[PDB]
Design a protein around this ligand. Structure first.
Ligand SMILES: Nc1nc2c(ncn2[C@@H]2O[C@H](COP(=O)(O)OP(=O)(O)OP(=O)(O)O)[C@@H](O)[C@H]2O)c(=O)[nH]1
Ligand SMILES: Nc1nc2c(ncn2[C@@H]2O[C@H](COP(=O)(O)OP(=O)(O)O)[C@@H](O)[C@H]2O)c(=O)[nH]1
Ligand SMILES: [Mg+2]
Lengths: 430, 72, 42, 442
């Protein structure tokens, strides 16, 4: 059961470097590629993320795509950069210019065929292929346009597998780019049709995690990308280690998605605590469960108390009792019953894995399907309607070739997604 | 949104009378007692009418038999 | 809504397999059968 | 003489590990399949034969299959300590799971793997001379256990016919829960299981957690404890075929005595001397005390209260130092109790069994060592409460087609939901009708 990862654009390549560092560390792979681990439990599932090259070496199943090689030269210069296969770096000669239309129509169609050849070469080598995993930002230019182009092509070529995405979306307060609403709206329109499961992260939530929970004095993008790499590496843990109650991406989708359009989820990771405080509190299932539902540890700006949970999933790593998990999930469902959708008799799925992440006795990653995600899309749609009524910067997109009808279609599709979430929020048994 | 104190984190005992998902079962039993009573009443009525039709058929047979005997 | 109403109407009219009445009629036929076949009062 | 065990999915394989650990330790077979050099001498014996066969060089190999669609659990058994005990052909594993979808196991994925399973079962049945049933362990909450278990039981029922199939089944607990789609899988499994099983024993993890908290002193139990208790129950039921006793009980006698009508085959299970080592030496454990113990609902391994219904039949298996006169005195005392009630059409409600072999003690176990134990499987109308809450949860979820698109996309007609829900409605009406008093007919 092998996963193929795709990292696109600056954010994707930067998050990918830390993800592959975390994965290489847990399996004890040196930056030269040599296995140096100390237990057979590490080797028996190495195939899941690494292919074996001759005389000991392992190579990571990842495709790197970008329109300007600056980021690729930075990742090749990094401490683990050597592990990546040289033929897997694909780059053009001019930037996306922060424009969705360039990334989707002009340089996208020029490079996309070489990316499809690399993705097919990587997919057909697996004895059994599991879903793809993609990291990219929706606010950028090549990430949104070329990522969604490639997602559409892979969904045409492999419609029976799973499609999973990790995506960065613009903060309502911390904008980095003026034309963010167009790129975000067009990308969300593409994702809601093509994707099977989509996770959303706000940089503001990672800053609030660092300042309030970790009390870091001077955080950097390396810390944010480490938190993201930790949560990304945690969801797949039951695929690649033994446990008392195994779980899988398809089983997560079956328990989390009630209706096919409702596939947007919130993320959280529990054992976060400052270096000064850690000597004062031991790990236990009640402490992880209490932090896991605290909105302070949840990675989007929308707050759960304004919505309702349709479904949720918790994956536990470590040597621990199943009774405490079952009774904790029952206690949280019973005391806060108003925040759970009443027409589903049990909203939480649990899973237990024997091997915790290195240096922690136990850990849990939380995936949540909550209607409060509608607030982010509404904010993007308001800013889009303010900009679109005046054709504020539209000549760039029209000069690349886009018809105005795509903007009205993407706006209508996002408005219907917000409406469908709002209808399930206010549904009743009657 | 509170998880509550630690001493109240344990398993609540199961009481099927106060289980919200079994109320139609108890309502069904409470209806079933009277349904059984009225079924018993209907059953005795059917038994009586069966006896009546048997008696009428017996009388008809006796009339036919005596007519068939007297013709000789 | 209309599909749900149709399914509820179908479900409320399901018939069980075993009956007290069926056993009762078979018993009170076997009663007279046993009385007929017996040779001492019953 | 012989019995074949079929283990399906994660719960069934993990419970199988505890069961085969116990059967090895009770007979004395080492983890490598042999016996010590001094255990060969003595009287000529074969009691292991019900579960093991010898090649002739003295290795033992077991009459079981392990079935899973994901490799991880079977790769863990293949790489563990008992590697040399199992035949490699016996450990069958697919490539990918049924992802909590009954439809994926039944229609799309189990159809490719089912023919290998039938070929292995055929290879086992050809090496027998007194096969007396199939034992099946699976959970109905997951996708592959429900779908492939149903498909395989259908094929076995066509090929082997009248041979008995007894199931140990893990049903979804009434308030502890692990996955959202449990009601759909349990309803769709139960529809197929109704036609193709002779007796089905129901287990709930919430009951075994309650039993481990109250009787044993374990604050943080895990699945190995529950699986060891289940293994003890299976050892108690199968002891009647393997050791001497006053009143033996063949596997056909359970089916003959416990099932009054062909659909009424779901039974409750309980076990008496669940006690810790520190408590066991301050108290006597007489026959009457453990017999009184088996009837409190705090002793049961299924979450149902029998005081809200009526018993139709009980089968009591005693193993160890017991004398028949004490069993008779105990059963007469139970019959005197006012909180135990039997349906008026079942005046002779009890079947007894008495075996001389006391229960075995496992090195890492948590139960004390005791000279006697009793295990009960019983048929009661209270079980109707278990189906009603699953059916209510199905109705709540299905009113809005909450997840149906997965099932219809993976190959199932929408009509199958309505058929299964109507069959379970008829089963509920059967349990309602059978429990109606026969008195007051005049
Ligand atoms: N008592 C007990 N219950 C278990 C055990 N393993 C899993 N379960 C329970 O069974 C249910 C999960 O069923 P699984 O066996 O994981 O399902 P599956 O057969 O693997 O089906 P797929 O997920 O599609 O592969 C949950 O209610 C678990 O709590 C076990 O070893 N002992
Ligand atoms: N969390 C995180 N965000 C990043 C990182 N690098 C860039 N971003 C954000 O992503 C957006 C810029 O998108 P970019 O990757 O340059 O788009 P591209 O030009 O299409 O590749 C801005 O909001 C940046 O703040 C990173 O390493 N981590
Ligand atoms: Mg499984």
């Amino acid at each position: 059961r092998e996963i193929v990862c795709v990292q696109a654009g600056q954010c994707g390549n930067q998050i990918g470097s830390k993800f592959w560092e975390v994965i290489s560390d847990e399996h004890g792979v040196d930056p030269t590629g040599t296995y140096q681990g100390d237990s057979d439990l590490q080797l028996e599932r190495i195939n899941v993320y690494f292919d074996e090259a001759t005389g000991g070496r392992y190579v990571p199943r990842s495709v790197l795509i970008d329109l300007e090689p600056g980021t690729m030269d930075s990742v090749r210069a990094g401490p683990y950069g050597q592990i990546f296969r040289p033929d897997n770096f694909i780059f053009g000669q001019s930037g996306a210019g922060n424009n969705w239309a360039k990334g989707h129509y002009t340089e996208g169609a020029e490079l996309i065929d070489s990316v499809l050849d690399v993705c097919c070469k990587e997919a057909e080598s697996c004895d059994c292929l599991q879903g793809f995993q993609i990291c990219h930002s929706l606010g950028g230019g090549t990430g949104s346009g070329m990522g969604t182009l490639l997602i559409s092509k892979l969904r045409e070529q492999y419609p029976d597998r799973i499609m999973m995405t990790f995506s960065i979306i613009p903060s309502p307060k911390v904008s980095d780019t003026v034309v963010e609403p167009y790129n975000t709206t067009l990308s969300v329109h593409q994702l809601v049709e093509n994707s099977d499961e989509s996770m959303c992260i706000d940089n503001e939530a990672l800053y609030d995690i660092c300042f309030r929970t970790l009390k870091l004095t001077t955080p950097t993008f390396g810390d944010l990308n480490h938190l993201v790499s930790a949560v990304v590496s945690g969801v797949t843990c039951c695929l690649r280690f033994p446990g008392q109650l195994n779980s899988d991406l398809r089983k997560l989708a079956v328990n989390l998605v009630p209706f096919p359009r409702l596939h947007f989820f919130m993320m959280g990771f529990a054992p976060l605590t400052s270096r000064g405080s850690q000597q004062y509190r031991g790990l236990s299932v009640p402490e992880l469960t209490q932090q896991m539902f605290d909105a302070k540890n949840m990675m989007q700006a929308a707050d759960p108390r304004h919505g309702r949970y349709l479904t949720a999933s918790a994956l536990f790593r470590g040597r621990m009792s199943t009774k405490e998990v079952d009774e904790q999930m029952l206690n949280v469902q019973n005391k806060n019953s108003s925040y759970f959708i009443e027409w589903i008799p049990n909203n939480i799925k649990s899973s237990v894995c024997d091997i915790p992440p290195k240096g922690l006795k136990m850990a849990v990653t939380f995936i949540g399907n909550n209607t409060c995600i509608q607030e982010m899309f509404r904010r993007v749609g308001e800013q889009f309607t303010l900009m679109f009524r005046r054709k504020a910067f539209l000549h760039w997109y029209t000069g690349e070739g886009m018809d105005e009808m795509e903007f009205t279609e993407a706006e209508s599709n996002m408005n219907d997604l917000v409406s469908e979430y709002q209808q399930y929020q206010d549904a009743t048994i009657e | 949104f509170t998880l509550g104190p630690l001493q109240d984190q344990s398993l609540p005992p199961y009481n099927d009378l106060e289980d919200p998902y079994l109320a139609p079962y108890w309502a069904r039993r409470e209806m079933l007692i009277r349904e059984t009573a009225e079924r018993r009443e209907e059953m005795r009525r059917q038994k009586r009418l069966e006896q009546h039709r048997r008696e009428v058929a017996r009388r008809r047979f006796e009339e036919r038999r005596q007519r068939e005997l007297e013709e000789l | 809504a209309e599909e749900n109403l149709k399914l509820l109407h179908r479900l409320e009219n399901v018939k069980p397999v075993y009956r007290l009445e069926k056993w009762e009629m078979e018993r009170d036929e076997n009663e007279i059968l046993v009385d007929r076949i017996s040779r001492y009062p019953y | 003489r012989e019995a074949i065990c079929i283990h399906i999915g994660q719960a069934g394989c993990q419970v199988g590990n505890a069961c085969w650990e116990l059967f090895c330790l009770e007979h004395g077979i080492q983890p490598d399949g042999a016996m010590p050099s001094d255990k060969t001498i003595g009287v000529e014996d074969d009691a292991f034969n019900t579960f093991f066969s010898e090649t002739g060089a003295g290795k033992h190999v077991p009459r079981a299959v392990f079935l899973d669609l994901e490799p991880t659990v079977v790769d863990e058994v293949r790489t563990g300590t008992y590697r040399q005990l199992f035949h490699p052909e016996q450990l069958i594993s697919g490539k990918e799971d049924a992802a909590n979808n009954y439809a994926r196991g039944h229609y799309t994925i189990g159809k490719e793997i089912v023919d290998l399973c039938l070929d292995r079962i055929r290879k086992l049945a050809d090496n027998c001379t007194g096969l007396q049933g199939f034992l099946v362990y699976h959970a109905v909450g997951g996708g592959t256990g429900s779908g492939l278990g149903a498909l395989l039981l259908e094929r076995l029922s066509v090929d082997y016919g009248k041979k008995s199939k007894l199931g140990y089944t893990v049903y979804p607990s009434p308030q502890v829960s692990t996955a959202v789609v449990e009601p759909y899988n349990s309803v769709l499994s139960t529809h197929s299981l109704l036609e193709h099983t002779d007796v089905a024993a129901m287990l709930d993890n919430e009951a075994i957690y309650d039993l481990t908290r109250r009787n044993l002193d374990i604050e943080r139990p895990t699945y190995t404890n529950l699986n060891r208790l289940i293994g003890q129950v299976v050892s108690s039921l199968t002891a009647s075929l393997r050791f001497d006793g006053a009143l033996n009980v063949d596997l056909t006698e359970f089916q003959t005595n416990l099932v009054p009508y062909p659909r009424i085959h779901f039974v409750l299970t309980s076990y008496a001397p669940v006690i810790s080592a520190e408590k066991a030496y301050h108290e006597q454990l007489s026959v009457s005390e453990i017999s009184n113990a088996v009837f409190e609902p705090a002793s049961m391994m299924t979450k149902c209260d029998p005081r809200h219904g009526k018993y139709m039949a009980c089968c009591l298996m005693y193993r160890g130092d017991v004398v028949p006169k004490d069993v008779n005195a105990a059963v007469a005392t139970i019959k005197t109790k006012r909180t135990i009630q039997f349906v008026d059409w079942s005046p002779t409600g009890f079947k007894c069994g008495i075996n001389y072999q006391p229960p075995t003690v496992v090195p890492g176990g948590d139960l004390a060592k005791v000279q006697r134990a009793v295990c009960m499987i019983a048929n009661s109308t209270a079980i109707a409460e278990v189906f009603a809450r699953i059916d209510h949860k199905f109705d709540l979820m299905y009113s809005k087609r909450a997840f149906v698109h997965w099932y219809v996309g993976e190959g199932m007609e929408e009509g199958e939901f309505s058929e299964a829900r109507e069959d379970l409605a008829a089963l509920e009406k059967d349990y309602e009708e059978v429990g109606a008093e026969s008195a007051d007919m005049d």
